Amino acid sequence: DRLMNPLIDQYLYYLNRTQGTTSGTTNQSRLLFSQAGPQSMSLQARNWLPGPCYRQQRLSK
Amino acid sequence: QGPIWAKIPHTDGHFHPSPLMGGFGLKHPPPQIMIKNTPVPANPPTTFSPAKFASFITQYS
Amino acid sequence: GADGVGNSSGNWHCDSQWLGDRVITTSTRTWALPTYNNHLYKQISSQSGASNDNHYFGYSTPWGYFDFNRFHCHFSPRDWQRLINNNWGFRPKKLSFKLFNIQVKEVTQNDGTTTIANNLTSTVQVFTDSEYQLPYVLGSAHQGCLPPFPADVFMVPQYGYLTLNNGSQAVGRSSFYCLEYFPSQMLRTGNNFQFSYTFEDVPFHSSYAHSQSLDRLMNPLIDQYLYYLNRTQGTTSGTTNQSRLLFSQAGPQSMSLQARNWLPGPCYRQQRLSKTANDNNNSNFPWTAASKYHLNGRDSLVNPGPAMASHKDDEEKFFPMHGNLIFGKEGTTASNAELDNVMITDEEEIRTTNPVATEQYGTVANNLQSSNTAPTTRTVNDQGALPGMVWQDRDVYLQGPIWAKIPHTDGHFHPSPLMGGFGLKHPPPQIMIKNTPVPANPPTTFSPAKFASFITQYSTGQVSVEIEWELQKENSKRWNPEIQYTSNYNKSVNVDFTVDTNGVYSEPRPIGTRYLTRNL
Ligand SMILES: Nc1ncnc2c1ncn2[C@H]1C[C@H](O)[C@@H](COP(=O)(O)O)O1
Ligand SMILES: Nc1ncnc2c1ncn2[C@H]1C[C@H](O)[C@@H](COP(=O)(O)O)O1
């Protein structure tokens, strides 16, 4: 997940707001998109996934 | 001080393809020679900007 | 070629592949041929006082003929797409004609049952008019071509020709032709016919449309150094200002006033018609108001006149009185069909080189203006040719004609088929076909009487036509995308260019050829 560039922003867009608008008067919902930045680090577009899995139970020493 | 040649239009048909303003009607006339001053970027910012560049050094050739 | 009974004299070659530089179209269809005119040549003519502009005199021959003067005979819908969307232009090159797998069936009506069987010892006769001595009857939009759909079977048309006539009568200079006086090859079952032809040099068709205009050819930024007169009187009009001669230097501002080097194509005004059956005049004028010509005192309708634009910008509803080729949809009577049963072709790509068919041509002066006389203007409705004119020809559509035999006269102007296509001095010759007459049962006593008792029989087999096409590739520096022909990706009822629920191929719309843009 930490493979991209910390300095430059992506030119791709993702949706991050479904309702929360200028919430006060007549603001129920609105579709809002953001351009990925170093700030939206765990939200940026991705090219790869992690390896497979088979959950194990957690034990303490 | 009159015109010299003229590019006969590339159509399906022509009659007597002589330039109406006078001169020599040419299928393939002396090609167009283009010229332009290569754009020189003025001073750039220390921070990266995706914005279209529009600050250039003024110059003539 | 010479082989036997149980040995096919040919294979089914129907395919097309591309060479990037050229394309070869191979087509094979099944044909059937009846016995026309009962093995007889018949003198045909106009009805005794049935019509005047339709008088005629000619003959009906027992021969049939092969035809494929339609593009859909060779190109599939898909191929036509590739062709249209990719090439500046194209043309015919070579030709290969083949007849094979011939079978002669003879039929007998015994009681109330028609039985059909094999008459192996029977022949058929073929020959090709390569000396061009028989009246060329092709290139007249006649029917009987090869089926657009390969699986369809077709009936081989009958040969009939016309001659010089004086009303219902004929002149002494008329000509009677017997196709039996031509050497022909006779074929039994297992025999085949071969023929190769080579197209002459003929200019590529315009599979392009101009991105520039005749009047919009100059530079939008710079002014002309030439001067024109734009003011004859209107001066600082107040005191003592009657008239003064004033000239202006052409600028981007005086765009439709600048000096010009070229003119639009010729014209022959057509009447304007609307598809909306209420915009029009409540009168029947498809003959009394249509543009027509006359020869020998005989009126003939100028159907596809000079190449003119169908409509001006922002209309697309007004088509010229027969100012373009109209195709009939599948399954539609030949007599007075509905407007929603025909396909009218739009020639709106040649707007930049050609005058509008229904609109005028321009303005002409016709008086000596002065203080005594006011200047007069004349609306020009008919314009011959002019030194400096440039025009684009018509268009070819998937189902349009391909070639046309340029008449052998003393003179031609711009010998391009009015219906569209390639004008050829020597076009693909006519291939004739006919079932060799078989005498029925003869009498034991000699009869000088003309023989007229024959065995009834029809022939059938396959035919193959291979044509090579030279291509002109596209070389444009257009930045933005050009327009392409395409199918509607939307959820649809039936598939465009396809058979239906009970097996009938149908061509939805006409297909233009001009989708790519080139400059002037
Ligand atoms: N300026 C100019 N250029 C070319 N041809 C000219 C010119 N002036 C007159 N002509 C004549 C000469 C040829 O006989 C004819 C060819 O027309 P075509 O339509 O090419 O068959 O055009
Ligand atoms: N389809 C077709 N066939 C032949 N020529 C064409 C055709 N379309 C346009 N032209 C033009 C090309 C030549 O410059 C001119 C020869 O005319 P001519 O009267 O032969 O001197 O005719």
From TrEMBL, chain A:
Transmembrane segments: none annotated. It is found in: Virion. It comes from the Viruses. Belongs to the parvoviridae capsid protein family. This is Capsid protein VP1. It comes from Adeno-associated virus 3B. The chain holds residues 431 to 491 of 736 of the full protein.
From TrEMBL, chain B:
It is found in: Virion. Coiled coil: none annotated. It comes from the Viruses. Belongs to the parvoviridae capsid protein family. This is Capsid protein VP1. It comes from Adeno-associated virus 3B. The lineage of its organism: Viruses, Monodnaviria, Shotokuvirae, Cossaviricota, Quintoviricetes.
From TrEMBL, chain C:
Disulfide bonds join C73-C145. Residues 1-493 form the Coat protein VP1/VP2 Parvovirus domain. One of its GO terms (molecular function) is structural molecule activity. Its main location: virion. It comes from the Viruses. Keywords: Capsid protein, T=1 icosahedral capsid protein, Virion. GO terms for cellular component: T=1 icosahedral viral capsid. It is found in: Virion. Belongs to the parvoviridae capsid protein family. This is Capsid protein VP1. The chain holds residues 217 to 736 of 736 of the full protein.
